[PDB]
Amino acid sequence: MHIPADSFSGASPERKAAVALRSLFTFVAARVVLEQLQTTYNQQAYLDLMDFLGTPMKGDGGDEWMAAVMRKNHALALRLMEVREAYLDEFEWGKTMEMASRETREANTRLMRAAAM
Amino acid sequence: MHIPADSFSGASPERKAAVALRSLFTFVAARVVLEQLQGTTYNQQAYLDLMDFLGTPMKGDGGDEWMAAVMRKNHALALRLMEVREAYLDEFEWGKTMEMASRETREANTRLMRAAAM
Ligand SMILES: [Mg+2]
């Protein structure tokens, strides 16, 4: 029997980061779809997306925002949902980890060198 | 923590996320150290200074402008904050974070699909 890796957390920096990532993916999806867009239905989708991009995602991973988009333009919301889910397989989280780690070490080294005698 | 506004315009989403995480780790470190300082005259001064600096933003650069400011005031405190934020790299549950983000993205899409299903 396979016992699955622990992937649960309550209030934690990991949860904070996870929700921030979810909002990032929703934003990325909006940008991807905007480029796709830039029929009469497609012109309206473009107008709607531009309107909705004018307002910030609440810090809930983009879901209040997405529900609002769906109320106005279901076809557009379906496309944004598809793209943000597809993006999960494209986002190079390992690279994010490498940069965050390497650049912390580099920043600490720079600061320590600057003050060193 | 609004990742699209982090790093520079033109950065990848991955780089924006990395810089945002760096700022998060700096903040986490500061909270850790503050707690430690509450439960020596130099130790009292580090507490006083940390309380002051937590009153100010670490806008950018992953907390490094903030850290340089701390170091100018209190080098020992900056060394400790640097140590903790670097140590935190290996404490942070990287895999869990991406899996939660991924799973909850799928779940949110499913919730919305089920809601529009009529
Ligand atoms: Mg298609």
Author numbering:
A (entry chain B): 34 to 71, 78 to 156
B (entry chain A): 34 to 72, 78 to 156
What's written in the study?
A stable fragment comprising residues 34–156 lacking the flexible C-terminal 33 residues was produced by subtilisin treatment, as determined by mass spectrometry (MS). We recombinantly expressed and purified the truncated CrRbcX-IIa(34–156) protein for further structural analysis. The structure of the selenomethionine (SeMet)-labeled CrRbcX-IIa(34–156) protein was solved by selenium-single-wavelength anomalous dispersion (Se-SAD) at 2.0 Å resolution. The experimental electron density was readily interpretable. The structural model was built against data to 1.6 Å resolution and refined to final R and Rfree values of 0.177 and 0.206, respectively. The asymmetric unit of the monoclinic unit cell contains four copies of CrRbcX-IIa(34–156) in a two-fold symmetric topology. Each chain consists of a succession of five α-helices. The subunits form arch-shaped, two-fold symmetric dimers with a hydrophobic cleft in the center, similar to other known RbcX structures. The N-terminal sequence of one subunit binds into the central cleft, with residues Met34 and Ile36 reaching into hydrophobic pockets located between the anti-parallel helices α1 and α1’ at the bottom of the cleft. The N-terminal ammonium group of Met34 engages in a tight salt bridge (lengths 2.53 and 2.58 Å) with Asp90 from the opposing dimer, which presumably stabilizes the tetramer arrangement. Indeed, CrRbcX-IIa(34–156) formed mainly tetramers in solution as detected by native-MS.
